[PDB]
A paper describes a structure:
Thiazolidinediones (TZDs), also called glitazones, are synthetic agonists of the peroxisome proliferator-activated receptor gamma (PPARγ) nuclear receptor with potent anti-diabetic efficacy in patients with type 2 diabetes. Overall, the structure of the PPARγ LBD is described as a three-layer helical sandwich fold composed of 12 α-helices containing a dynamic or flexible internal ligand-binding pocket. The PPARγ ligand-binding pocket is among the largest in the nuclear receptor superfamily, ranging from 1200 to 1400 Å3 in crystal structures with three branches described as ‘T’ or ‘Y’ shaped. Branch I is located proximal to helix 12, which forms a critical part of the activation function-2 (AF-2) coregulator binding surface; branch II is located near the β-sheet surface, close to the predicted ligand entry/exit site where helix 3 meets helix 6 and the helix 11/12 loop; and branch III is also located near the β-sheet surface but deeper in the pocket near helix 5.
We solved the crystal structure of the PPARγ LBD bound to edaglitazone at the orthosteric pocket, which unexpectedly revealed a bacterial MCFA cobound to the alternate site. Edaglitazone contains a bulky benzo[b]thiophene group adjacent to the TZD head group, in contrast to other TZD-bound PPARγ crystal structures, which have smaller moieties (e.g., phenyl) adjacent to the TZD head group. Crystals formed in the I4 space group, a different space group compared to the >150 crystal structures of PPARγ deposited in the PDB. The structure was solved at 2.1 Å as a homodimer with two molecules in the asymmetric unit (chains A and B) with the expected alpha helical sandwich fold. Strong electron density was observed for three ligands in both chain A and B molecules: one edaglitazone bound to the canonical or orthosteric pocket; a second edaglitazone to a surface pocket created through an interaction between two symmetry-related protein molecules; and a MCFA consistent with the size of a nonanoic acid (C9) molecule bound to a solvent accessible region near helix 3, the β-sheet surface of the orthosteric pocket, and the flexible Ω-loop region. The combined binding of the C9 and the second edaglitazone may have contributed to the stability of the PPARγ Ω-loop, which is often characterized with very poor or absent electron density in most published crystal structures. When bound to the orthosteric pocket, rosiglitazone and edaglitazone make conserved hydrogen bonds via the TZD head group to the side chains of S289 (helix 3), H323 (helix 5), H449 (helix 10/11), and Y473 (helix 12). The TZD head group of rosiglitazone also makes a hydrogen bond to Q286 (helix 3), which is not present in the edaglitazone-bound structure due to a 2.8 Å shift of the Q286 side chain from the rosiglitazone-bound position (5.7 Å away from the TZD 2-carbonyl position).
Residue numbers in the entry: 207 to 477
């Protein structure tokens, strides 16, 4: 019935607001500079990156052994820390999806392990436009050109996310749409190694119905938005699997290189 589906949509939106401090709405307000609550420092080359480090307050601190004087590695570490924050936000959010916590714990672990990066890239798009991306909770704005011009493959690290984002962002979802979509991602019955797929697919069937109603009500003029959104899950998968391969190539070209321990656990036996 439609009433239960609407209550689910509201419940998920409420949980998403409690779990994710930086929402798309706040990111869009920052990106549209007519909301001059402040203004992010624009980073576009080495000098501006070094200047931004002076001006931006960083929350996360790499161990001294893993600090690098090299611009591309410091940026890489900035990205990792966004993922370490997001994994914990996503976990809190997942526990509020009805039925998730009653699943076998091993299946909960599997759904998070394989779901977090597809969500991370979904919400990364909320911080991007065709010209660049917000960094450090919106204190800075790193340009896309700059990110393309990084050495070794870090151009291949950034550009596919930008290509995804500008198309994903043309769907014009809001946070109340995204709250349901990321729950659909988590409750994926096709993750490797799942033990009881049927209880997962039964939750996802309910989430898909709530997502379908929500897009119908919230985007009445957007033709086939539901279908187009679900097709983006294919793009998201490709970004993750290509990222995983790319990381297996940086390891060869740097034996000493370091992932945050949380990302080491996520990537371990991932694909
Ligand atoms: C928070 C974090 O981020 C990363 C990481 C991020 C990006 C790439 C690779 C790794 N890993 C950790 C966990 C470990 O974080 C620490 C361990 C130990 C110390 C104390 C001295 S410093 C040193 O180098 N070894 C020590 O015992 C210190 S101090 C500030 C941190 C820290
Ligand atoms: C690009 C950038 O720079 C900074 C920054 C720079 C200096 C200081 C502070 C911040 N902020 C951002 C935005 C965040 O953009 C990302 C977040 C997370 C990921 C995924 C990780 S990175 C990895 O290898 N495994 C993961 O989970 C990836 S990937 C391409 C981008 C990306
Ligand atoms: C690693 C060089 C300095 C930047 C690291 C930024 C991580 C903290 C943050 O802004 O989220």
């Amino acid at each position: 019935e439609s009433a239960d589906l609407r209550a689910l949509a509201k419940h998920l939106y409420d949980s998403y607001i409690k779990s994710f401090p930086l929402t798309k709405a706040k990111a869009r307000a920052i990106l549209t500079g007519k909301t001059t609550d402040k203004s992010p420092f624009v980073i576009y080359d080495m000098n501006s990156l070094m200047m931004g480090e002076d001006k931006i307050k960083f929350k996360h601190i790499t161990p001294l052994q893993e600090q690098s004087k090299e611009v591309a590695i410091r940026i890489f570490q900035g990205c990792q820390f966004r993922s370490v924050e997001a994994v914990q936000e996503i976990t809190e959010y997942a526990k509020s999806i009805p039925g998730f916590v009653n699943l076998d714990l091993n299946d909960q672990v599997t759904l998070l392990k394989y779901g977090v990066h597809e969500i991370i890239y979904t919400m990364l798009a909320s911080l991007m436009n065709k010209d660049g991306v917000l960094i450090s909770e919106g204190q800075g704005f790193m340009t896309r050109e700059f990110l393309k011009s990084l050495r070794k493959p870090f151009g291949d690290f950034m550009e596919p996310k930008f290509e995804f984002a500008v198309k994903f962002n043309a769907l014009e979802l809001d946070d109340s749409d995204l709250a349901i979509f990321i729950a659909v991602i988590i409750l994926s019955g096709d993750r490797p190694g799942l033990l009881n797929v049927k209880p997962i697919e039964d939750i996802q069937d309910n989430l898909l119905q709530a997502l379908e109603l929500q897009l119908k009500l919230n985007h009445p003029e957007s033709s086939q938005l539901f279908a187009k959104l679900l097709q983006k899950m294919t793009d998201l998968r490709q970004i993750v699997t290509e990222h995983v391969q790319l990381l297996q190539v940086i390891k060869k070209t740097e034996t000493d290189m370091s992932l945050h321990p949380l990302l080491q656990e996520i990537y371990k036996d991932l694909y």
